[PDB]
Amino acid sequence: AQSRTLLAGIVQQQQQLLDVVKRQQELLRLTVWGTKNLQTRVTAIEKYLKDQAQLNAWGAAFRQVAHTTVPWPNASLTPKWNNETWQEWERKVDFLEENITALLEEAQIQQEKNMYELQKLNS
Amino acid sequence: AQSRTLLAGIVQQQQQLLDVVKRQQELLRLTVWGTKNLQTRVTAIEKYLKDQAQLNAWGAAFRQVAHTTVPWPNASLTPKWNNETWQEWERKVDFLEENITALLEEAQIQQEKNMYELQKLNS
Amino acid sequence: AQSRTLLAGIVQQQQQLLDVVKRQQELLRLTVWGTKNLQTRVTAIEKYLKDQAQLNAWGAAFRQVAHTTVPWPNASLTPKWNNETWQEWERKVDFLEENITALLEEAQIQQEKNMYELQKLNS
């Protein structure tokens, strides 16, 4: 008279939900790659911006033996403020990924134990 | 003597969790739009950077009938390496979205079946 | 003869899944900060690009009492089209965060009620 079939669906449903949660974790990682990839493109642009500062005046002296070069800074490079703050951002993600993996591990162990107990009821 | 009320809460709870998971999928899509939107802005900047290369020296020749134009490349355009890698990134998201939709469909069908079975117990 | 132990695992499992979902919400917020942070860097670049337009020709006139300054626009600033569309993007996230918080609140209240009912069965 036990409703094992109803429990099997409920237990099975939890497994389905757990799988979808895992898919979100992999999807989230793909998004992180896009953001980081954009930064790499930004660094390439900074190099080119520095070149523009080098460009100042060509042939602006055909009656003098001198050339005016004005390589004024162009791209503001972040040495410590963004790096320290960005590492903190990455660090928070690392703790969340480690905490989520722990919870997923317990769920998998608990999920299998719940199904195992169900078989013992009528097996 | 069956604990249908406890099961109704458990079954109902799974429905609530399923709804929240769906909300994350829509929220994830909004984040993807922001990343892609930034790239469109980056392309506009590349056009302007090319213009800076065109700027070289104006009036740098008032004793000669010539003008020095130095349009040296400025923005490094990605033709195949980033596109092929980016398509792979988008492709992975497409498979994950299709797999998540399949799991959600099964959960909805299974979720309704679990509630339907519960009514048959006392209906 | 009630399978409270099986229910305790199922009820406990839902709590574990709820916790992981909350972790995704915090992880999603960290990703939003990275995207917004990139835009701040982009604004700094726009200021520098304007400076490049100012750079035109230095000393390109050693036989005339005039200087040619050509500060042609460089960074295309978005005043209304991107802001209005971006606010809509942020607005959608705000409604999703508010809706997810509501669902989480109901789950927590319902989750505790389900455990409370279980104790009454044998307490």
Enumerate the residues of chain A whose CB falls inside 8 A of the CB of residue B55.
55
Measured CA distances, B109 to A24, A76, B7, B112 (Å) = 21, 55, 18, 5
CA B32, CA C41: separation in Å to the nearest integer?
19
Which CATH number is C56's domain given?
1.10.287.210
**Residues sharing a CB contact under 8 Å with residue B99, sequence separation 6 or more, in sequence order:** A23
Host domain of residue B107: 1-123
Contact C14 B9 (CB under 8 A): no
Tokens of C119: 């104790």
**Nearest residue to B48 via CA among C115, A119, C64, C49:** C49
CA B13, CA C21: separation in Å to the nearest integer?
14
Provide the number of structural domains found in chain C.
1
Residue contacts between B and C (CB atoms, under 8 Å): 125
**Nearest residue to C49 via CA among C76, C83, C82:** C76
Q: CB–CB of B35/C35 below 8 Å?
A: yes
Gaps in chain A (C–N > 2.5 Å) come after which residues? none
**Nearest residue to B30 via CA among A42, C75, C17, C36:** C36
Q: How was this structure determined?
A: NMR
Name the residue with tokens 């896009």. Answer: A34
What is residue B122's three-state secondary structure? coil
CA C55, CA B113: separation in Å to the nearest integer?
71
**Nearest residue to C100 via CA among B98, B28, A98:** B28
**Nearest residue to A4 via CA among A111, A108, A107, A119:** A119
The three-point CA angle C54-C59-C62 to 5° equals 145
3-state helix, strand, coil in chain C (%, to 5): 75, 0, 25
Q: Which residue of A has its CA nearest to C34?
A: A35
